[PDB]
Design a protein around this ligand. Structure first.
Ligand SMILES: Cc1noc(C)c1-c1cc(C(N)=O)c2c(c1)c1ccc(C(=O)N3C[C@@H](C)O[C@@H](C)C3)cc1n2CC1CC1
Length: 121
């Protein structure tokens, strides 16, 4: 019971935002879902109810899964927040998320302000 589309903001999130974040030095733990068995975190899925990662976001952008840019921005917010709330403040993963979230926020500030659907053939 869901469908997506191509908007100017969603295209910006794919072509500008995801391009800057995907290739970053600190992106590698965020490129695929948190593997709690590999990491030895048996409480992860008890605490985190909505896991999210950049690989899922990228795939969703490529397959036009989102109806609006706000849904994609929520996925980014969830991914960063999951990381901060679950982990210890002294874990380096926290600083890696902080570095990427700062880039994310700056790019969102430069996004075209009004959401419009595009005709993409
Ligand atoms: C994100 C995130 N939020 O909370 C946590 C915890 C995470 C989060 C998520 C993942 C994941 N996606 O499963 C994850 C890590 C942290 C993580 C930390 C360290 C190492 C590690 O020790 N390495 C790998 C490095 C390439 O080389 C070293 C030599 C050894 C692997 C890790 N992975 C595995 C991923 C590479 C596939």
């Amino acid at each position: 019971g869901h469908m997506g589309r191509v908007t100017n903001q969603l295209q910006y999130l794919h072509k500008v935002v995801m391009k800057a974040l995907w290739k970053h030095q600190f992106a590698w733990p965020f490129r695929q879902p948190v593997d709690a068995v590999k990491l030895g975190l048996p409480d992860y899925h008890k605490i985190i109810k909505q896991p999210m990662d950049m690989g899922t976001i990228k795939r969703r952008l490529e397959n036009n899964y989102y109806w609006a840019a706000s849904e994609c921005m929520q996925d980014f917010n969830t991914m960063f927040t999951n990381c901060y709330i679950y982990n210890k403040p002294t874990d380096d993963i926290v600083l890696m998320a902080q570095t990427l979230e700062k880039i994310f926020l700056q790019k969102v500030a430069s996004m075209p302000q009004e959401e419009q659907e595009l005709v993409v053939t």
